[PDB]
């Protein structure tokens, strides 16, 4: 009934009624109905009597939320005609018109004086600056306007980044339990990418500026993701984040069906007309070369390789993902990245033991070499006690079943100079 | 349950057609001022099957239009839920909380253009009366 | 009119979407319009016709994130 | 659905009989009996109540075979529907007197519609029903005319006059907004527009509620 907004008025009263009681209406009653799961199928009774106010963060308000943020940090003047050109349908003609009341109000005061002249002269010609500055806020709304399109489509694969980058991090639940990440989390990397950049100190060219924020928040998020993370998937994030700078990246190609076989195209019913091939191939190596072969690039992979004297040697070298043979048909040449992507699909067919090795030379070719560096490093996490971790949130060390982190800040709480209050949680006291 | 469907005569009340929407919108939009004999007749722009004259007028174009906007509202809903999922009904209590919206919010806001402008003409008038005040 | 037609609908129809589903039905309302030959202000953000500075003002000091969803 | 199996245990004691649907026969015979009974009220129409019957139990039985439960899940007919159209059409046969076949078959047909029309979602579907149900009123009356078959509308009412007689769709429907203006004026708080579907619907809600058992 209350939703309904259903009044029983009578005897100039106003009257609901609630059961079996009857209860007076009293205005100035508003009821905010809320949830916290997002995922909710209300009954169509209850659709049609509220407003439904989603507050769920996703991929586009993301994606909006950071390209404001970067729009206001990197290019304050985009920023700043962005609010203007927001201001001037309501916010200016607000202020002229309180402009134009004073001025009434100051008239109707000074009744006109001829010696009051000079302070309604400035008034008015104040007055007719401020109606100027509008009057020329829109002569040049287009012009703005396209200003701020080009501004923001620079900035856009930085945004369409960072809304991929979050997701990815906030999925990363799945592989394994304790990769569970916040927004707040995310957020804080990107200000620090954005603020509190040492590569960023004397930087002036947009475009450079745009390009090192990219690059850092790659790094940034990779690094402090990681140092949190399994030393097993360490490659798997990094193939991520490769994978997202390349759909970001121009003048590539997506690698769509590339990618797709590598990851879920090596299964596919291939297995009848498997030919033993050379000695050197085994059957299940036989069976990945067909798989392989399906792709445009690699039609001719049967001769490619029975042709090849030195390919058997490949096969039994300690590296083989050091020197790969061209053995893909490409009729125009490819970039270092489409050259990595052919490689690691032939690592994948042969010796697949090296895939792994050969998965972060990929990372080297699509993110940059020593991506990976940081991590081989000792954790250096002083700084990290002291900046990148506000107080109000706890530092938690976890450690593989049978290993202490204890050693690590006790050592550097002594370097610090600073207390610890250390103290066992098995006990109930 | 069949038993319930049997001993009780079963009438299919069914969503509001397209000329149930445009009637709705059009009574209840008849107080707002939306004649404009300046209205340049377009092309296309069709919806509601049995438009009240061949060629709409301002009024009629603007009920064509709120039932274009819960049509689509419906066709929106039918392509998320094609996509995946996760949707809202729409019902004719939506219509009726869009028309209710609609009515307020331009009668508040020709209410307060039409402040502004009657402030302005006062301001006109006095400006003038201080105009003939500096010529004394 | 039409200004006023697409803020109704923005806020009676246009609720429970992401932002992306939000802006394409925005889109085909404001579309549609041109399409009907009804004059709505071009390009007219939604933000500050409902709202103006000082309620904005007063919501962000009310704890409330300065992302355009939630304004 | 709500239904449980009963146990093995106890259905070896009780043996089960399953009563199906009355046949087209059976319904025949009930239904007649009940259509003689009604139709003494009218002596002019006795001599039609053998041929009414079957077109009910006809038009019943084709309604049987289209719209299955498949198809939506309250389509389901059983010889209760034929109950409530002999109810119906008693019911408005009471107080009139003097009604030639033409009165009957108009309030056959609108019976008809308002049991088996009206609950179907789809135009196909009532489309389907409008013309099956004016070829078994010729099919069984062949030297009637059409007079009670081209009236697309067939809507009755006794708001307008002392009993149900068919009335003309224009005065109804101006009656009916006159008493929803007077019913959301004093009764409901908000505007009440009547368009089509409200003024069937209206039509359907009012017949029910004169009914017994309705």
Same mark, same amino acid.
């Given at each position: 009934?209350?939703?309904?907004?259903?009044?029983?008025?009578?005897?100039?009263?106003?009257?609901?009624?609630?059961?079996?009681?009857?209860?007076?209406?009293?205005?100035?009653?508003?009821?905010?109905?809320?949830?916290?799961?997002?995922?909710?199928?209300?009954?169509?009774?209850?659709?049609?009597?509220?407003?439904?106010?989603?507050?769920?963060?996703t991929r586009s308000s993301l994606q909006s939320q950071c390209l404001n943020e970067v729009l206001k940090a990197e290019r304050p003047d985009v920023d700043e005609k962005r609010s203007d050109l927001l201001k001037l349908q309501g916010e200016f003609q607000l202020r002229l018109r309180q402009l134009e009341?004073?001025?009434?109000?100051?008239?109707?005061?000074?009744?006109?004086?001829?010696?009051?002249?000079?302070?309604?002269?400035?008034?008015?010609?104040?007055?007719?600056?401020?109606?100027?500055?509008?009057?020329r806020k829109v002569e040049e709304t287009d012009i703005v306007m396209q200003e701020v399109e080009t501004v923001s489509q620079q900035y856009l694969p930085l945004s369409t980044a960072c809304s991929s980058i979050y997701f990815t991090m906030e999925s990363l639940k799945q592989i394994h339990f304790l990769y569970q990440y916040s927004l707040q989390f995310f957020l804080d990397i990107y200000h620090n990418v954005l603020y509190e950049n040492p590569n960023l100190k004397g930087v002036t060219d947009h475009t450079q500026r745009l390009s090192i924020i990219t690059k850092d928040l790659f790094q940034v998020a990779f690094n402090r993701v990681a140092r949190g993370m399994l030393h097993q998937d360490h490659i798997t994030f990094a193939m991520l984040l490769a994978r997202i700078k390349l759909k970001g990246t121009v003048g590539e190609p997506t690698y769509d069906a590339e990618f797709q076989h590598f990851l879920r195209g090596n299964e596919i019913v291939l297995s009848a007309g498997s030919t033993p091939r050379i000695q050197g191939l085994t059957v299940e190596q036989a069976e990945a070369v067909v798989r392989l072969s399906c792709l445009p690039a690699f039609k001719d992979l049967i001769a490619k390789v029975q042709?090849?004297?030195?390919?058997?040697?490949?096969?039994?070298?300690?590296?083989?993902?050091?020197?790969?043979?061209?053995?893909?048909?490409?009729?125009?040449?490819?970039?270092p990245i489409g050259q990595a992507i052919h490689r690691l699909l032939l690592i994948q067919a042969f010796r697949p033991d090296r895939l792994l090795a050969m998965a972060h030379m990929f990372v080297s070719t699509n993110l940059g070499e020593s991506f990976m560096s940081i991590m081989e490093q000792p954790l250096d996490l002083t700084h990290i006690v002291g900046t990148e971790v506000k107080p109000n949130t706890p530092v938690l060390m976890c450690s593989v079943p049978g290993y202490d982190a204890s050693g690590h800040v006790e050592d550097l709480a002594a370097e610090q100079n600073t207390q610890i209050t250390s103290i066992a949680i098995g006990s109930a006291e | 349950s069949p038993a319930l469907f049997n001993r009780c005569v079963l009438n299919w009340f069914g969503d509001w057609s397209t000329e149930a929407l445009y009637q709705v919108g059009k009574e209840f939009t008849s107080k707002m001022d939306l004649e404009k004999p300046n209205y340049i007749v377009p092309d296309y722009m069709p919806v509601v099957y049995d438009k009240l004259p061949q060629p709409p007028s301002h009024r009629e174009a603007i009920v064509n239009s709120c039932v274009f906007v819960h049509q689509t509202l419906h066709? *929106?809903?039918?392509?998320? *839920?094609?996509?995946?999922?996760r949707t809202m009904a729409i019902t004719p209590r939506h219509y009726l909380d869009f028309i209710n919206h609609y009515a307020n919010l331009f009668h508040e806001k020709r209410s307060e253009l039409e402040e502004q402008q009657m402030h302005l003409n006062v301001g006109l008038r006095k400006i003038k009366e201080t105009v003939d005040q500096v010529e004394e | 009119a039409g200004d006023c037609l697409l803020s109704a609908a923005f806020i009676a129809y246009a609720g429970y979407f992401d932002q992306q589903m939000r802006q394409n039905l925005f889109t085909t309302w404001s579309h549609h319009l041109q399409q009907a030959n009804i004059q709505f202000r071009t390009d007219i953000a939604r933000t500050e016709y409902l709202s103006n500075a000082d309620e904005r003002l007063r919501w962000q000091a009310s704890s409330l994130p300065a992302d355009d969803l939630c304004t | 659905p709500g239904r449980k199996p009963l146990s093995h245990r106890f259905l070896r004691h009780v043996p089960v009989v399953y009563v199906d649907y009355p046949g087209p026969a059976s319904l025949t015979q009930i239904y007649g009996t009940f259509n003689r009974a009604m139709l003494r009220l009218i002596p002019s129409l006795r001599t039609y109540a053998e041929p009414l019957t079957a077109a009910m139990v006809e038009f019943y039985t084709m309604s049987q075979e289209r719209f299955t439960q498949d198809t939506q899940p309250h389509y389901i007919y059983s010889p209760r529907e034929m109950t409530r159209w002999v109810r119906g059409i008693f019911e408005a046969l009471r107080p009139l007197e003097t009604l030639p076949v033409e009165g009957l078959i108009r309030i056959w047909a609108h019976e008809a519609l308002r049991l088996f029309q009206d609950r179907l979602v789809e135009d196909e579907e009532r489309r389907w029903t409008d013309e099956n149900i004016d070829t078994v009123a010729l099919?069984?009356?062949?030297?009637?005319?059409?007079?009670?078959?081209?009236?697309?509308?067939?809507?009755?009412?006794?708001?307008?006059?002392?009993?149900?007689?068919?009335?003309?769709?224009?005065?109804?429907?101006?009656?009916?907004?006159?008493?929803?203006?007077?019913f959301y004026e004093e009764e409901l708080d908000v505007p009440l527009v009547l368009f089509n579907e409200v003024l069937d619907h209206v039509l359907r809600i009012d017949r029910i509620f004169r009914q017994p058992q309705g």
């Open positions: 009934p209350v939703l309904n907004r259903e009044v029983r008025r009578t005897g100039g009263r106003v009257l609901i009624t609630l059961g079996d009681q009857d209860i007076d209406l009293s205005p100035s009653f508003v009821i905010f109905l809320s949830t916290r799961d997002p995922t909710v199928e209300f009954p169509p009774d209850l659709c049609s009597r509220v407003t439904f106010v989603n507050f769920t963060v009341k004073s001025l009434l109000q100051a008239l109707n005061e000074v009744k006109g004086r001829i010696l009051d002249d000079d302070t309604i002269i400035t008034t008015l010609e104040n007055l007719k600056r401020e109606a100027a500055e509008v009057t042709a090849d004297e030195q390919f058997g040697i490949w096969l039994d070298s300690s590296s083989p993902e050091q020197t790969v043979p061209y053995l893909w048909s490409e009729e125009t040449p490819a970039t | 066709q *929106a809903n039918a392509r998320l *839920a094609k996509r995946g999922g | - | 099919k069984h009356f062949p030297n009637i005319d059409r007079e009670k078959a081209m009236s697309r509308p067939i809507l009755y009412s006794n708001w307008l006059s002392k009993d149900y007689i068919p009335v003309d769709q224009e005065e109804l429907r101006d009656y009916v907004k006159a008493r929803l203006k007077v």
